[PDB]
Ligand binder design. Structure first.
Ligand code: X3N
Ligand code: ZWE
Lengths: 245, 1027
């Protein structure tokens, strides 16, 4: 009575076994064919302490088992025997998928249409998420560059204030106001240029502050729609599995 | 940090022809100066000081030479422009300004640090500001490898230096397969030695017929005998003259920088074996040893400025593992929809969990605070050396769980110390598509971007600094665990069957216990070590300690087998050290260059910066410039990736510190690529909506400018440093009609005898597509050819060059005299037919190879076609069409463009998985059967099928090597190879769960079905529409 059993999963791949065993992390289990060449020999996947362990059900002289004592007449008897020894906990049931042929088919198209519209929104959110992340890192380094630029022009001011100090004293004494106003014309040009640079840096600091808030809101929208997107994938896959039966 | 764009200024791709530069003088004045975008800093400084005399304080300005320029670069660094020959556009300024300053410090040390930082991508001063003692300990300790590698180059110099720069390009074995030996005239080869006589290059040739296995010195000896044959020397005088001067010359490949400097047989050199198979005349150039040794500069290795309590054993602490989650700073989540958050944690040894995962209590999203001690189901002594904490903050919303931010920590630091005390961990974002609640395979360490959710942690303290035990302690404990087998005929037969199994095979729990119980018998069959290691209970001190002893005295294994022990599945330092020991003693420089893509990738799996694999790869990079060249580009190509920027940056810095004069050549290549990236970025972004004719006008105008001509001429090809790229043939350069509009470039080969190899060297530069998939497919095609050729199966592939040099940027080698199947169809008539004539290909090939050379061309088409049929079947390359299949004028069929064959594998919404069917077009069978109408039954088709069967089984014999090469690539950021399930398809095609005879019948079934599947469908070729 192996085809009647819920835990027997025909010929599924190793990828689908590990996919159907992630949140269920205790003693969940299922059985499947070991190989097409063997056919009569099957394999039992059990959860254990995290890693999905695989134990083969040997078949010789009609009797089944794991070790030398083949004290089991059928594969179904072998599994039911180890459930009673535990009292293995939860079977991965292919039949149990709770929600007529017309209603199951029309509502499947509705869940698939809704899943594809929400998948499209996740692609739009992710494209803007990565674009925003790239632009934030650029603005973060552009601020470091502006900081070093300002430090260089500040050192240039301290260089001018030191060298011009002795020449301004000479021209004040000599009454040469033309040369005092010529050095001051260049000083107030250097100082106005620093104001233009600090205004540019602070202008970019606010763009970075606002783009960081945009990024946090894109990530909130992604994290709020990611669980909705996974439960819709699991719902539509159950409607297709029941539609085949 | 590394630059985000190759633009000449921040947010500006190209500077205008003239630009206003704010020059900050040393007297304190500020002068705005108009400069040309291509002006050198020498010109800009001279023009600045002329104008400076007009401004005030001109009396305080010393000579121009006494000063140097400074500015902020786009890497946010204060660069001192020592090299004043640099153009304004090539300076990478943040904004147009330059400060004139008195130079300070060691000029020569600062020049080198600029050259290292430029080749790396980031400045060297960034590594100085890193406070992590592991990062500074790596920088200091790795220089031991660099000093040892440089000491090897000056051991028997200048020959040792010549061998480093020009390593002999050889095959791993000197045995020539029977098909290669049969191409020799009675075992002999006819070669042509060339010499330059007059200064204007008056050449002189010497045709010699010599044994294929003559070492280059015996080739030189025969050339000396031919030149001194009519000089009245006695048989004794000639013998002593030959023996005296044979060691005074060296041979060089005509047309490229490939030298025959080592005592390998001539035929073992790849160029000569290639000439043997292709039936080409080897053209070598003889020259004096001093002619090459005078060209080699002795660049000395100067040491940099950066080069200058009780402990209890882990096994003493008899207690359960405990980790306390204090709190997270923030989490990007909406208070509505998501109800609560929690920190899922787990202790892992690679991908396998060592125990049941332990979660914190659920807390509201707005207040992430736990202060909960988590207890794990493993005792502290049972922690293996590679034990790691993998954690993440998850959300709850039947009930759905989703990860928000993840992070992992090494429970043992680089000094073997167990983690203790408080520590902050900046978490990483969840990758696209990862629905798993933990990311064990993800990068281990705190996120450098400190503007991320930070989780505070606390590890228990045990009075003293806990350290992992010594090997003396582990060896003694292993002998204790044995004091607390049987065998039968079935047991030896079962062990041999398990060792031959492919790595991806399912190992049962009974098989795991069977291998562990007979672990001492396993040493007799050493190829089973990977299976036995998976059977070890890694969360058991007793089994791990005993395994360590078996690894200690385990016999060596083939390097191809040892490579498996470096993938994600084997994280233990003792297993990885064993793998590196096998590669140190057995991996030849030919095979190391062959598998360098994977060996650089498995560096990412290493827990610590300094380790035996990196010390091994950096030693081979610094003692073989061919290995070193691709070691540089494979690491440089991933410097944009912040996940590995620091690891690969520190490694590239150590490479550049001691690579010698080659750092100058790599900077030339980096400059040239930066210009091509910037030029193509303009065409890709702003000038994208413009016409092909308009884009070409812009391309010509920009490429002619002096900054471009200097940067893109006279530099070594990154695809093959033996090829020099001289003057650029601008009339031959063009934007190609292909995806992402790749740029076709053409350069003169500046070699003196370029005429005897290739006059022009053409390369396709592509900006947009990820070339890692093409690089890996081409590597596999080369490895398949290499297996077949070594086995004696003459199947000729064309694994043309492909190299990724950045984020979705790369170079593809141009194959000369080749055209797509559609280009053959269009070239040969057409008349608007809708259905291409199937015989067109045969006719084209007939015209290209008329007369005697006809039968040879058909044989080459058959041999190349057979192996591409097998390769495309095994790898599932189903995206083949008349525009991505090419045939050379000589008949060699080969495939191109391998970035898109896995796009439709996904299967979503009932598309039956889109199984890749085996197919062979009627067009090719007509070529194979020499124009026969009933081509599916000829004796030529019979031989063709036999070629494919033998080749298919030859790849199936080495199935574990291909599975291992892909298994090592899982850690790379390639989205096509993330889990072992992406490789699983190769087991369906190779039929690994079947016998060899059953797999041969399986392949024959798929090949006979391909004859039916090769339907001549009545549909047009442009759109494919049936009536
Ligand atoms: C004159 C020209 N010759 C040629 C063209 C393309 C490739 C090639 C040679 O060498 C083979 C390598 N190759 C590879 C590619 N491409 C590839 O890998 O992806 C798309 C395409 C693109 F890069 F051009 N194109 C070539 C021709 N027949 O039109
Ligand atoms: C991944 C990956 C593969 C696998 N091949 C397939 O999965 N083919 C396939 C099957 N079904 C469909 N629909 N399309 C393609 C395999 F060869 F390893 F098996 O080959 C690769 C390769 F050569 C290079 C590379 F960078 C990555 C890979």
């Amino acid at each position: 009575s192996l085809q009647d059993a819920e835990w027997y999963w025909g010929d599924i791949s190793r990828e689908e076994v590990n996919e159907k065993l992630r949140d269920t992390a205790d003693g969940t289990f299922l059985v499947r064919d070991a190989s097409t060449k063997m056919h009569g020999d099957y394999t039992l996947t059990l959860r254990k302490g995290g890693n999905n362990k695989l134990i083969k059900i040997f078949h010789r002289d009609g009797k089944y088992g794991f070790s030398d004592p083949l004290t089991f007449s059928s594969v179904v008897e072998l599994i039911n025997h180890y459930r009673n020894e535990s009292l293995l906990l939860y079977p991965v049931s292919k039949y149990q998928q709770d929600q007529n042929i017309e209603a199951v088919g029309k509502k499947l198209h509705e869940y698939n249409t809704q899943f594809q519209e929400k998948s499209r929104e996740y692609d739009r959110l992710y494209e803007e998420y990565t674009r925003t992340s790239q632009e934030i890192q650029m603005k973060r380094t552009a601020i470091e560059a502006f900081n070093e630029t300002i430090k260089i022009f500040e050192e240039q001011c301290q260089t001018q204030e030191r060298y011009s100090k002795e020449y301004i004293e000479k021209f004040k004494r000599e009454g040469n106001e033309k040369e005092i106003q010529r050095i001051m014309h260049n000083y107030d040009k250097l100082k106005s240029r620093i104001s233009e640079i600090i205004d540019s840096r602070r202008r970019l600091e606010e763009d970075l502050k606002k783009q960081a808030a945009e990024y946090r809101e894109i990530d909130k929208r992604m994290n709020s729609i990611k669980p909705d997107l996974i439960q819709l994938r699991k719902t539509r896959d159950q409607y297709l599995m029941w539609l085949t039966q | 940090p590394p630059r985000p764009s190759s633009g000449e200024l921040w947010g500006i791709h190209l500077m205008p022809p003239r630009i206003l530069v704010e020059c900050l003088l040393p007297n304190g004045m500020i002068v705005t100066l108009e400069c040309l975008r291509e002006a050198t800093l020498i010109t800009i400084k001279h023009e600045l000081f002329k104008e400076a005399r007009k401004y005030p304080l001109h009396q305080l300005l010393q000579d121009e030479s006494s000063y140097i320029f400074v500015s902020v670069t786009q890497e946010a660094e204060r660069e001192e422009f020592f090299d004043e020959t640099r153009r304004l556009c090539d300076l990478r300024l943040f904004q147009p300004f330059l400060k004139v300053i008195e130079p300070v410090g060691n000029r020569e040390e600062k020049i080198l640090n600029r050259e290292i930082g430029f080749a790396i991508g980031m400045p060297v001063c960034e590594f100085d500001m890193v406070k992590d003692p592991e990062v500074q300990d790596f920088r200091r300790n790795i220089l031991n490898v660099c000093k040892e590698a440089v000491d090897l180059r000056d051991l028997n110099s200048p020959h040792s230096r010549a061998m480093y720069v020009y390593p002999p390009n050889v095959e791993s074995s000197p045995e020539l397969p029977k098909h290669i030996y049969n191409k020799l005239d009675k075992g002999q080869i006819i070669v042509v030695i060339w010499v330059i006589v007059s200064p204007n290059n008056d050449k002189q040739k010497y045709t010699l017929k010599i044994n294929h296995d003559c070492v280059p010195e015996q080739v030189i000896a025969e050339a000396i005998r031919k030149k001194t044959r009519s000089m009245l020397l006695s048989s004794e005088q000639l013998k002593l003259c030959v023996l005296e001067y044979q060691g005074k010359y060296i041979l060089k490949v005509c047309g490229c920088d490939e030298y025959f400097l080592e005592k390998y047989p001539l035929s073992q050199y790849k160029y000569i074996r290639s000439c043997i198979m292709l039936g080409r005349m080897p053209n070598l150039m003889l020259m004096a040893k001093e002619s090459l040794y005078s060209q080699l500069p002795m660049d000395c290795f100067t040491m940099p400025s950066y080069s200058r309590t009780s402990t209890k054993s882990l096994w003493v602490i008899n207690s359960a593992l405990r980790i306390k989650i204090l709190c997270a700073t923030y989490v990007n989540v909406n208070i509505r929809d998501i109800d609560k958050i929690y920190v899922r944690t787990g202790i892992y040894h690679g991908g396998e969990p060592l125990c049941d995962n332990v979660n914190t209590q659920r807390v509201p999203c707005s207040n992430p605070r736990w202060n909960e001690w988590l207890n794990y189901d493993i005792y502290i002594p049972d922690l293996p050396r590679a034990a790691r904490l993998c954690l993440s903050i998850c959300s709850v919303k039947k009930e759905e769980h989703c990860p928000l931010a993840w992070g992992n920590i090494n429970l043992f630091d680089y000094t073997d110390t167990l983690v203790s005390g408080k520590m902050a961990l900046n978490l990483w974002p969840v990758p696209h598509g990862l629905e798993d609640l933990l990311n064990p395979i993800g990068v281990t360490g705190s996120n450098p971007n400190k503007e991320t959710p930070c989780l505070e942690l606390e590890f228990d303290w045990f009075s003293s600094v806990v350290k992992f035990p010594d090997m003396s302690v582990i060896e003694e404990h292993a002998n204790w665990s044995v004091s607390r087998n049987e065998l039968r005929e079935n047991d030896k037969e079962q062990l041999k069957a398990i060792s031959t199994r492919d790595p991806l095979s399912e190992i049962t729990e009974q098989e795991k216990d069977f291998l562990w119980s007979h672990r001492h018998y396993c040493v007799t069959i050493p190829e089973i070590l990977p299976k036995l290691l998976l059977s070890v209970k890694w969360n058991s001190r007793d089994e791990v300690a005993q395994m360590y002893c078996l690894v200690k005295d385990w016999p060596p294994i083939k390097p191809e087998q040892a490579m498996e022990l470096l993938d994600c599945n084997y994280p233990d330092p003792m297993v990885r050290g064993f793998a590196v020991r096998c590669l140190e003693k057995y991996l030849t420089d030919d095979k190391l260059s062959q598998y360098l893509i994977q060996l650089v990738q498995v560096l990412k799996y290493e827990q610590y910066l300094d380790n035996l694999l990196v010390r091994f790869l950096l030693k081979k990079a610094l003692t073989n410039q061919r290995i070193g060249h691709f070691f540089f580009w494979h690491l440089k190509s991933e410097m944009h990736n912040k996940t590995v920027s620091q690891r690969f940056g520190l490694l590239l810095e150590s490479y550049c510190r001691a690579c010698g004069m080659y750092l100058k050549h790599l900077n030339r290549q980096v400059e040239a690529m930066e210009k091509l990236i910037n030029l193509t970025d303009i065409l890709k972004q702003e000038k994208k909506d413009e016409t092909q004719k308009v884009q070409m006008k812009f391309l010509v105008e920009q490429m002619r400018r002096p900054d471009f001509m200097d940067a893109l001429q006279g530099f070594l090809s990154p695809l093959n440093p033996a090829h020099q790229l001289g003057n650029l043939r601008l009339e031959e350069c063009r934007i190609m009609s292909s995806a992402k509009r790749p740029l076709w470039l053409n350069w003169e080969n500046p070699d003196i005898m370029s005429e005897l190899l290739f006059q022009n060297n053409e390369i396709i530069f592509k900006n947009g597509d990820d070339l890692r998939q093409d690089m890996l497919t081409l590597q596999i095609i080369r490895i398949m050819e290499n297996i077949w050729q070594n086995q004696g199966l003459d199947l000729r592939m064309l694994p043309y060059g492909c190299l990724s040099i950045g984020d979705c940027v790369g170079l593809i080698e141009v194959v000369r005299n080749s055209h797509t199947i559609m280009q053959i169809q269009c070239k040969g008539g057409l008349k608007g037919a809708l259905q291409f004539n199937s015989h067109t290909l045969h006719q084209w090939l007939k015209d290209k190879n008329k007369g005697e050379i006809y039968d040879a061309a058909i044989d080459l088409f058959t041999r190349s076609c057979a192996g591409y049929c097998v390769a495309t079947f095994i790898l599932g390359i189903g995206d083949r069409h008349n525009s991505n299949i090419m045939v050379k004028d000589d008949g060699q069929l080969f495939h191109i463009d391998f970035g898109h064959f896995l796009d439709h594998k996904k299967k979503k919404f009932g598309y039956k998985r889109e199984r890749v069917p085996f197919v062979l077009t009627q067009d090719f069978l007509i070529v194979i059967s020499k124009g026969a109408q009933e081509c599916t039954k000829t004796r030529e088709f019979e031989r063709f099928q036999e070629m494919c069967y033998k080749a298919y089984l030859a790849i199936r014999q080495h199935a574990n090597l291909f599975i291992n090469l892909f298994s090592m690539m899982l850690g790379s950021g390639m989205p096509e190879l993330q889990s072992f399930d992406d490789i699983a398809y190769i087991r369906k095609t190779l039929a690994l769960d079947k016998t060899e005879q059953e797999a041969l019948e399986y392949f024959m079934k798929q090949m006979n079905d391909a004859r039916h599947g090769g339907w001549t469908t009545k549909m047009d070729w442009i759109f494919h529409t049936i009536k």
